[PDB]
Amino acid sequence: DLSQCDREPIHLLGGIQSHGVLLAFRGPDRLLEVVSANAQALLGRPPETLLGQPVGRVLPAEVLAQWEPLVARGSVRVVLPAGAYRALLHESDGLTVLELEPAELQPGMEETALEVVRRLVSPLAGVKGTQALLQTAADTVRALTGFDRVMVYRFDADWHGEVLAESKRGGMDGFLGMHFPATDIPVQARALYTRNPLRLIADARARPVPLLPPVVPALGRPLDLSNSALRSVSPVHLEYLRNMGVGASFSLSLLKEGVLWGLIACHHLEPLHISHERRRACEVLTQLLALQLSAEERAAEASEDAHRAALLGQLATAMGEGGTLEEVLEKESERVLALTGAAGVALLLGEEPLLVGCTPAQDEVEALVAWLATQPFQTSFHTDRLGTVYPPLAARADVAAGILAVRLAPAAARFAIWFRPEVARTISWAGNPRKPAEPEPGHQRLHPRGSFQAWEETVRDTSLPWKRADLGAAEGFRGALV
Amino acid sequence: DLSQCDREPIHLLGGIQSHGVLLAFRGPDRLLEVVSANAQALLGRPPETLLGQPVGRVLPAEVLAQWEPLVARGSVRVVLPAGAYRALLHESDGLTVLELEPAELQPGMEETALEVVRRLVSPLAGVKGTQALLQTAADTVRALTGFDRVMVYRFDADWHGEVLAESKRGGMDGFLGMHFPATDIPVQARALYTRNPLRLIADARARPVPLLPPVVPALGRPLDLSNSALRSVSPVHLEYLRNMGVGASFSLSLLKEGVLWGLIACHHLEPLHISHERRRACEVLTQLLALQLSAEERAAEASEDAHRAALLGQLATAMGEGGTLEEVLEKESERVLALTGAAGVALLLGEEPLLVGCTPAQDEVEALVAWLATQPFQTSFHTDRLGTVYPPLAARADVAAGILAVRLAPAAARFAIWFRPEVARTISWAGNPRKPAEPEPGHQRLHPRGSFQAWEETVRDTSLPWKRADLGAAEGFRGALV
Ligand SMILES: C=CC1=C(C)/C(=C/c2[nH]c(/C=C3N=C(/C=C4\NC(=O)[C@@H](C)\C4=C/C)C(C)=C\3CCC(=O)O)c(CCC(=O)O)c2C)NC1=O
Ligand SMILES: C=CC1=C(C)/C(=C/c2[nH]c(/C=C3N=C(/C=C4\NC(=O)[C@@H](C)\C4=C/C)C(C)=C\3CCC(=O)O)c(CCC(=O)O)c2C)NC1=O
Secondary structure, three states, X not given: OOOOHHHOOOOOOOEEOOOOEEEEEEOOOOXXXXXXXXXXXXXXXXXXXXXXXXXXXXXXXHHHOOHHHHHHHXXXXXXXXXXXXXXXXXXXXXXXXXXXXXXXXXOOHHHHHHHHHHHHOOOOOOOOOHHHHHHHHHHHHHHHHOOOEEEEEXXXXXXXXXXXXXXXXXXXXXXXXXXXXXXXXXXXXXXXHHHOXXXXXXXXXXXXXXXXXXXXXXXXXXXXXXXXXXXXXXXXXXXXXXXXXXXXXXXXXXXXXOEEEEEEEEEEOOOOOOOHHHHHHHHHHHHHHXXXXXXXXXXXXHHHHHHHHHHHHHHHHHOOOOOOHHHHHHHOHHHHHHOOOOOEEEXXXXXXXXXXXXXXOHHHHHHHHHHHOOOOOOOEEEEOOHHHHOHHHOOOHHHHOEEEEEEOOOOOOOEEEEEEOOOOEEEEEEOOOOOOEOOOOOOOOOOEOOOOOEEEEEXXXXXXXXXHHHHHHHXXXXXXXX | OOOHHHHOOOOOOOEEOOOOEEEEEEOOOOEEEEEEOOOHHHHOOOHHHHOOOEHHHOOOHHHHOOHHHHHHHOEEEEEEOOEEEXXXXXXXXXXXXXXXXXOOOOXXXXXXXXXXXXXXXXXXXXXXXXXXXXXXXXHHHHHHXXXXXXXXXXXXXXXXXXXXXXXXXXXXXXXXXXXXOHHHOOHHHHHHHHHOOEEEEOOOOOOOEEEEOOOEOOOOEOOOOOOOOOEOOOHHHHHHHHHHOOOEEEEEEEEOOOOEEEEEEXXXXXXXXXXXXXXXXXXXXXXXXXXXXXXXXXXXXXXXXHHHHHHHHHHXXXXXXXXXXXXXXXXXXXXXXXXXXXOEXXXXXXXXXXXXXXXXXXXXXXXXXXXXXXXXXXXXXXXXXXXXXXXXXXXXXXXXOEEEEEEOOOOOOOEEEEEEOOOOEEEEEEXXXXXXXXXXXXXXXXXXXXXXXXXXXXXXXXXXXXXXXXXXXXXXXXXXXX
């Protein structure tokens, strides 16, 4: 892809986080083939001496005693001399990968998790606004994790994001309302986070633990850690966290109708480990937030659609109360404009355009119609930034930043064209977006930016976006005009 | 008809179930005001001798010690010699009402509850039909409760209901697909179940335990048990369960947008107690089902709306591509009828009615219009059983079991009328619905029916119901016809 940021193979860095141990076994005899360099933390022997040994000569008796539930369930609690660990199995590169990390210490964790689930599944949840839904999600994740700061981050259409909601303990700074470049979470990270929806960085200053040997011998590259809970993340991102002053990080993918919509991101000022089962409990909260957001958005669409049909019916009542079409459309100007949330409309019904509300002048409308008659758009054309495609109205964002045009005739230049002004938007970037990274001379090592201080820009010349309900209303009104 | 079934004051029967104890306290000194007759085994004293005594001389110290979180949270777990008990606190009739029942004994209950929550909130759980959502809810509630039979029961428009999905042990009979009279769950029960969304009948054969005294002395009537977990239910319902062969019963209200949509009903062949904590975990599943159903229904409405707008746009194009109306609408008959999912349409424009698709004859249409012209409706009229409200077409259920009519003029008999045939429906009732109860002579004591065996009827002369999207499409087409 575009950036050098996009090229780092984050699933092939060959490192795990220091609080866990990884062992990968090969074949029907379960021979140890890859092992983390710290594995004496649970094995007792130098890990290199155990490569090639079958699982029964490698793992502690306590783990072997749980082998059947581990294999059949993929996850089991094991009590080791170091304490309670969660053992996790997955498959990668033709190997069975066993990961061990400290297990949840609170027996009541799941009881607590169900209580916070009740907040997000509550009878009629989000009846205060979808902002209230986002805030409850941040608050419940903060309550369940104990992280200092929890943020709801939504990706915009160009893959840059903004913090929509924040929950944090007193005295903490935050990022509420701030925008971050698309390169802060590059394309291969977004792809990984669509498939693996959770990631914990327990200690942002800890050094990674390498795997032994550094390649899977059959493949000649490091073991694929895509599905590994212990994977050590990109060094550039660890520097980014350090530049933010963050000691530990935990994020969850928000997958809404199958696409990566955003993240819940959590920051702690000191190292902090969250158990596997507690991370999975937080995942339930994020899935519930996605479902609540979907329910509310679809309900909003249904309500908007009903309003559009009601307007079409009110306009039909007004027609045939007497008078010509032009008289009725002028008398019912507010209803005609409300069909598409517009500030003006031009109707080309055979003669000069009938201008209702705020439109460009007759000459400019006539020129736009002659241009529209050449473009290929079936029945409807819409844009929220007319000036980028139609330079004659680029300076007229006061009345024509966006248009929605519908055809009223197969070949003839007969149209209804609704108009919208620009909506200026002042946004605060977390750091200068013109300098989204600090590469070294030669552009070969790359570092994150050092500053996240607010940097203000105002976006101009773009209207509110045309909504699905606006487009349907316009198609429905074509029949009254044809 | 508010019948005898509806008048039983089920919140004032003055009894609790035998597996718990109830105590109600009055005033700043928390004097014992009401106590269940079985309370001696947990009070060490015969309960009547403790009325009027302060809570410190009534309750064991183990209860009073968590009084604060009990008042704060409404529920705590208390460990007594007889075992672990759940204490529940609510307010009724100016009294503080304390209930004690056996506590959950499985340490992993909530862990199991989260796992079934994941199945029901899977990344788009119910990805091939809401029927799959209903089955998953039945299956997960059965897994969590251990009840022999779990059914999803939906209330229809007349408050009779039907079993839409079922999960049951092998060898059980069931009620899948069967319909039950509205009087099976009478009006005051439905009202109570909208406010208190869970109820357990742990032993359908056990006798009620009376409260002492039999009235709240200040009020002269029994304590209001509307919000009591231990409330003994209507004796007629206990007889109903007996006649069904059911030994224990647990139901949860499905509240979808503030309205009682249905129930999840659970039956066991023998007595069975489900802890309060486990019931509330099942409540999460039922709230999640309601949320999933709402999300899917709203998404379906949005999709159907888009199809109607597309059809209106396609008709407008067809109208502009040349020809008389009579020619275009005949040629586009499929699309015009699809606007409202109809099988025919009559247009009362200028001359004789224009009939497209399957309609009554011209004379029957002109008989129908004059009847419509005197009916009170703003711009649209619709019914799915024309024959009841308009007998002249009761014989034309082949083409006109339902109609959707819209006005095309303020004065004058000008309409568009879409027509639908009947959809015959063969339904199985659980018992003869003409004999929904067995009253004793004098009609003063009622008993439930004795048989739930399938009793088949075929419902005729009713069309499919007219959908919100059909009404919106009809309103949107009015503009094209005026
Ligand atoms: C409040 C706003 C906010 C934002 C906007 C935010 C960003 C964020 N980035 C990441 C991850 C990564 N970033 C980069 C690369 C680069 N980052 C840059 O700045 C440039 C220099 C660059 C390359 C040229 C890579 C390769 C990864 C993948 C790491 C891996 O999985 O291996 C994560 C997930 C991890 C986590 O939860 O901590 C988050 C949540 N975290 C916040 O709280
Ligand atoms: C598969 C289908 C299916 C159905 C359709 C079904 C019905 C059902 N009824 C009830 C409750 C009550 N019924 C009646 C009265 C009458 N019942 C009759 O037949 C006539 C004679 C009559 C009066 C003339 C009253 C007063 C109550 C309130 C009890 C209380 O709360 O005190 C409940 C909730 C309790 C529970 O989950 O077990 C359910 C679930 N249970 C199933 O499984």
